[PDB]
Structures are given as C-alpha cells and as structure tokens.
C-alpha cells in the first residue's frame, strides 16, 4: 500500500515536470540576443577594511548603505563605517564559532550565530552606551546556516537540521517552522517585500516559503551539488542559486523553471556567495578560486573579474543603492569595490 | 580636514583597533584541540579526566598553558559543511577504543573515520593525537576471543603487546602525507595522571614545529 503512495508521488512529479517543460516556452538566451553587452567591468579597491584576525564568514550591509557588520571566527562582530573605514562597534561573542550575521533594517539590532545552534540578537542603540544581548533564540538542533532580519521583531533562521524557523524577538519563541528539505539548509534569502523567502539546502534543491502562510509553494531541482548561496533578483520575480557544481543558475518564480546557467570551463570550484546589482544587470558570484566574477546576468557572459583576494571569497554583499560591492575572504580582509 | 566629531570617531576606531589587537594576541596562544571519535569510543572519560545542544566546549589550563577542547559529537548533520571552520586548531584528538575490536566492524568504522579526517584537504599540516582508550581490558578480552575477527591478515598471537603493536602500526599506516603531519599515539591506562601530560607534551611539540615554520628556521 505504501508503494501506491510512492507511485502517486512519482506520477505527480512526472506530471509537474511535464507541465514545466511543455509550457510552450522559449530559451532565455534567445530573447536576450540583440542587447548590448555591458563590456569590460573594472572595479578598483576603494577601501580595505582591516582589523579581523581570522577567516571572516559573513558580512551584511546596513540599509543606509554606509555601515556594514562583519563576523569572523575570532569571536568578534565588527561594525564598520565604510565611508571612512572606521570601526564603530566591536561586539565579543559567547561562541567564537560564528558563520552568520544580519543587520536589522532599522539598524537597532544585529544577529549572529553558528555551531552553537543559536543566533543571538544584540541591541546596538542602548542607553547604557554598550552593546548587550537582547535575546538568545534557542530551539534548533543544528548549526544555524543563516538568520536574516525579517523585521525589527521577527527573524528567519535556517540551520543544519533540515528546517527553517520564524522567531518573535519579544517572546523568543518559534512562531512558525518550515520543513521539507532533506539536507542541511545552507542559504536563506528574503524577498524585497519580506513576504516570501527562499531556502537552499544540500539536497540540490531550493524551496519557496510564505512566512505568513507557512508551507512550501514552489520547489526547484536544477543543481547537482550542494547549494551554498541564494540571492533574490531585485524585482523579486527571480533568484540565483550558487552551488558547489561550479555553476550558478537563474531560477524563475513566475515559471517554476530554470532560466540560465553561468558556467565557464576554466572554473571547476564552487560558489560561496551570490549577489545581484541594483538593477539586476550584474550577478556577482564569489568563487573559492581566490577571486570573484561579475557575470552579465542577461547575456550570461562573464563581464569582469574582481581578483585581489589571497584566499577563498567567503562573503559578498551589495549596497541597496548599488554604490559599491563589498567582498570578504578567509584572509580576514574586507574590500570595497566601486 | 576632519572636524571635531569625526576626529573623535577616528580616536574611537583606533582604540577599538588596540583592544582587538590585545584580544587577538591573547587568543593566538590558545591551544585548540578538536576531539573526535566514531561512537562509544569513551571520549567522555577523556574530557572528564582533562576537566578534573550544539558543539560542547571545555577550557582548562596545564603548566601555564590554556587549552580549549571542542567536542563536536552532538552535531550529526554533515562534516563537509562545517569541518573547514576548524582549520587552525592546534591538534585533533582521536579516541578510538580497544574493547570494540570485534563488536559491531566498529574498528573498521573507526579506521574509515580516521582516513576521512586525516587525508583531508583542510587538515594537511595539522597533527593528530591518537588515543587508544579501553586499553586495560582487551588484555583479558583476548583471553577468550581472538583477533582473527578484526583482521584477516593477522594470525600471530592473542597477547597485549602483539595486538597493541599491530593496531598501532595499522592506524599509523593510514596517512599519506607522512612529512607535513605527525601522528602521536597513546595507550590510555587505568586512570593514570599521564593522560594530560601526554597531551601537554604533544601540543608543545606541535607548537615548536609551528613556530619553526613561522620563523622559516625549520
């Protein structure tokens, strides 16, 4: 009788695949044929933020596009004023094993976590003048891969226990949990309106969740190896997944389909970070080839190289206004490119 | 030029730089050990001797030296996704047991784990401190059961010294880079005080080698 369940599931899977393929569709590259390539893209290191003494693992730009928070295994969260390379806050951490960092949209709080299975919330704008722990959100049974501030009072966490959670900072309780991944959820990306989000796990699949509704809506299986990074297109109607297959892929929420693949034969190593531009015309992929690539998203050709890092490019971010792109590698260096 | 407020901001940034420098200097002399093992390998006894959810932490001191031991047995998600975070630990403490040479096979799983973690891209120059727990009872275990279950290539003797030597050389013949890293091996006894002393001596040797490499004097 369980075989009947499996047969129904596989028949539905085949029907979904048939519906996807038989949309009477056309290849993306065909439509983006007669558009002018962006040309050679040259970006210089305007600023180099130094002060970390260990491999940094994540950074996040503030919504003012001036302050950025960076996390490293040396057990320090450093908030930098990118315009003057000034440290404004240095927060020690209870556990030095941190691989996540988020900056609140309002700028009041930050969050960080890692192998300790919690990403605590730090309050920056304190009357006492220091930075103190607001809440210790606990309940995950795995290392937190990424927690992003959905709101000033809500956060979304994705850990290595094949699940994601939505928290409420006031009470520190899991408001909603999302399940369905059969592997360590490695990346989490929020929609521009913070209504939907996308989670990418090690089962070579990505899933789209509604935070207010609380269940999977669309699933994408195009990659081969683990998916390490996902970023939404600025329009919110598409997203890009970087995997360990050395290829990034552009996925369409509108069509539940694969749009483009950015693969070059000279690259055989995975992607640790993916981000877009303000207009979504440039896709910045941070490879562990000690350098970063900038791909013309529409035409799929590589537009430029952002070499100048002495180790694997771990984290990558782009400001909201698109003024600059910041890259952080395992050499404990932050580089601003403009 | 700068105003008063941004000059004060620069002063604050410089002060933060100084404090971070002191914390980094203090933490650069922390002896980091990564405790490993397959299962039922008796590393709980090991951490108990050294001391007196998520990855558990132990901190202690021995002869003016601060040791941080990280036990990661509670995170059974995937080693390939977070094992690179430990690139930089002073040593890896493997605690294979010697009373599981026949029960489920388990010795083969321990050897497979040793191959997986030793011939690893992240741990190339990182030494490994092998611990052979439960030594004091397979002596009387082999008074009934033979070694033929574990090893088809051994038919020599069911005695302590012979079996210990064969297991020693079998685990030693598992690393390919026999120059960039060394595998110190121990025979943990009946709760003897030397268990911490051996770790101290091994980590001092590893620190001396690392310092020689840093100076280029090696």
């Amino acid at each position, epitope marked *: 009788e369980l075989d009947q369940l499996r047969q129904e599931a596989e028949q539905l899977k085949n029907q979904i695949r048939d519906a996807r393929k038989a949309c009477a569709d056309a290849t993306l590259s065909q439509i983006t044929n007669n558009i002018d390539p962006v040309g050679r893209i040259q970006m210089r290191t305007r600023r180099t933020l130094r002060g970390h003494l260990a491999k940094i693992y994540a950074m996040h730009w503030g919504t003012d596009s*001036r*302050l950025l928070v960076s996390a490293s295994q040396d057990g320090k969260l450093i908030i930098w*004023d990118s315009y003057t390379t*000034n440290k*404004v*806050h240095a927060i020690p951490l209870r556990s030095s094993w941190v691989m996540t960092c988020a900056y609140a949209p309002s*700028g009041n709080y930050v969050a960080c976590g890692g192998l300790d299975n919690i990403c605590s919330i730090y309050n920056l*704008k304190t*009357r*006492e*003048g*220091n930075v103190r722990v607001s809440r210790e959100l606990a309940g995950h049974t795995g290392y937190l891969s990424c927690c992003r501030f959905l709101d000033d009072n809500q956060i979304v966490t994705s850990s290595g226990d094949t699940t994601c959670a939505l928290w409420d900072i006031e009470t520190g309780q899991q408001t909603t949990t999302f399940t369905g991944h059969t592997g360590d959820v490695m990346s989490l990306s929020l929609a521009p309106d913070t209504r939907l989000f996308v989670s990418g796990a090690c089962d070579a699949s990505a899933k789209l969740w509604d935070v207010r509704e609380g269940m999977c809506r669309q699933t994408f299986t195009g990659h081969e190896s683990d998916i390490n990074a996902i970023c939404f297109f600025p329009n919110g109607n598409a997203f890009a997944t970087g995997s360990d297959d050395a290829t990034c892929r552009l996925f369409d929420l509108r069509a539940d389909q694969e749009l483009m693949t950015y693969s070059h034969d000279n690259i055989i190593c995975g992607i640790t970070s993916v981000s877009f531009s303000k207009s979504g015309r440039l896709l910045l992929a941070g490879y562990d080839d000690f350098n970063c690539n900038v791909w013309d998203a529409l035409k799929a050709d590589r537009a430029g190289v952002l070499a100048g890092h002495d180790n694997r490019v771990s984290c990558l971010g782009v400001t909201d206004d698109g003024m600059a792109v910041a890259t952080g590698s395992w050499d404990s260096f932050l580089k601003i490119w403009n | 030029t700068l*105003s*008063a*407020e*941004d000059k*004060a*901001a620069v*002063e*604050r940034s410089k*002060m933060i730089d100084r404090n971070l420098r002191e914390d980094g200097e203090k933490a650069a002399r922390e002896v980091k050990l990564l405790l490993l093992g397959a299962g039922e390998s008796g590393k709980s006894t090991i951490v108990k001797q050294m001391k007196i959810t998520g990855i558990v932490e132990t901190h202690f001191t021995f002869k003016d030296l601060h040791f941080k031991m990280f036990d990661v047995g509670g995170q059974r998600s995937e080693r390939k996704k977070w094992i690179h975070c430990f690139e930089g630990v002073t040593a890896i403490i493997f605690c294979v047991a010697l009373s599981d040479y026949d029960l489920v096979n388990r010795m083969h799983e321990s050897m497979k784990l040793f191959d997986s973690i030793c011939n690893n891209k992240w741990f190339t120059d990182t030494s490994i401190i092998l611990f052979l727990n439960k030594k004091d009872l397979f002596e009387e275990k082999i008074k009934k059961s033979p070694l033929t279950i574990c090893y088809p290539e051994y038919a020599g003797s069911n005695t302590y010294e012979e079996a210990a030597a064969y297991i020693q050389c079998q685990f030693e013949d598992l690393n390919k880079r026999k120059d960039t890293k060394e595998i110190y091996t121990h025979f943990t006894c009946a709760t003897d005080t030397k268990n911490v002393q051996f770790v101290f001596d091994a980590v001092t040797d590893v620190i001396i080698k690392n310092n020689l490499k840093d100076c280029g004097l090696f």
Partner: single-chain antibody
Amino acid sequence: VQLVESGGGLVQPGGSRKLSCSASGFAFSSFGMHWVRQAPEKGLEWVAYISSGSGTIYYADTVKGRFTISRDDPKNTLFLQMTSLRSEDTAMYYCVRSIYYYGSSPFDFWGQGTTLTVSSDIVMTQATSSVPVTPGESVSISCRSSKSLLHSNGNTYLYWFLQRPGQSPQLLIYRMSNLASGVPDRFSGSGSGTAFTLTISRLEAEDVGVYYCMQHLEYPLTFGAGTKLEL
C-alpha cells in the same frame, strides 16, 4: 544613568578645589566627558573635555592652565582640579557625557550639577532674549552663526538644548535635524548655513525654559545667549 556631582562650595580667590562626578548606570570607560559652566544669571560656557581613554584633552580659552581635568575609569569618576579661582569662575557646573561615532548623539545626558560661589571663535547669536508664547501655538527660535557650520562631509554640527527652571539642560536636537531619544516629536530643526531655526509645534506644558544653540564644528564649543520662553 546617574551623574552625581560634588565638591563645590565657597573658596576665596586664589584658592584650590576639586570637583568630582560619579557615574552610575553606563559604561564610563567608552564615554567622553565634558565639564560645562553656567554663570548664575547667564548661559552655558564650555570649560573642559576628555576623550575616551584620556587620549585627547581640551580646555577653554579662559581656563586653560590653572584648570586641569582627569578621569578614573576604575571607580567611574571624573575630576576637575581648579586652582587660582578668580572671582569669575563662580558658577554652576555640569558634567556631560558624550559618545562619538557615526549616528551617536553627543551631549545626550547631563549631570545635576554643583555650585561654586567664589568670593578666533564661532560667535553665535540668538536674536531673542525673551518672547511670550501662547500655550497652544507654534514658536520658532532662531540662531545665527558667524562661520558656516556645514562641513564638507555633509554634517551640520549644530545642537539645540533646553533647560527648564531648576533642572539640568537636556539635548533636544543634534546635528541640526535629528531628534534626541525621548524628545517628543513637537520639536524640529531646520535652516541652512549660518542661519538655523528650532520650531516647536503645538506647544504645551513642560516646554517653558531657555533654549540654547551650540556649535560642534571645532573646539572651543560655544553657546548662544539663550532664548527665554514664557507662557
């Protein structure tokens, strides 16, 4: 947050005294400190300053020399040693905490103050000394600088404080536009280089007092004559 201040009183001219300010409620080590005077029937007068870690120390033009200032982080205290106390330093003294980083609000908290009863600057003018105010109307207070306060980094270093009768001044607006924490939204700051205005919309009780405009472009910090508002 408490800044309790003591050591003032009666000293003859030429005497020596020490003013202590004990801090309890915040991280004294990271905060910079200021000592600010106020004559018995005049406005505020910046006196001294210590940065965090005592790295940089500044003194006013009229007190540099005989006046010395120091801090002790261990017990969270700030000392001002006054010598050669002429019959001009008779005043009411305050200690003001101030943290300096991108987005901070300097001069946010003020001490209660002590009382001493001794026996090339950016002149800033407030055109109004006293003005009647309807308890249900909106009123504007104008400050006028000599040197333009709009710096090259886009910040206008103008601060607006309010002192109620018998209480320490409280920071209303910092950097000419940003309301301080806890300040009701009835207060706004506007204007342009060398011409600034604080607007109070829908004035009510607890708005009477004297409003002071201060510059932070460079030391020495200087204030205005202060505008008195009466219902």
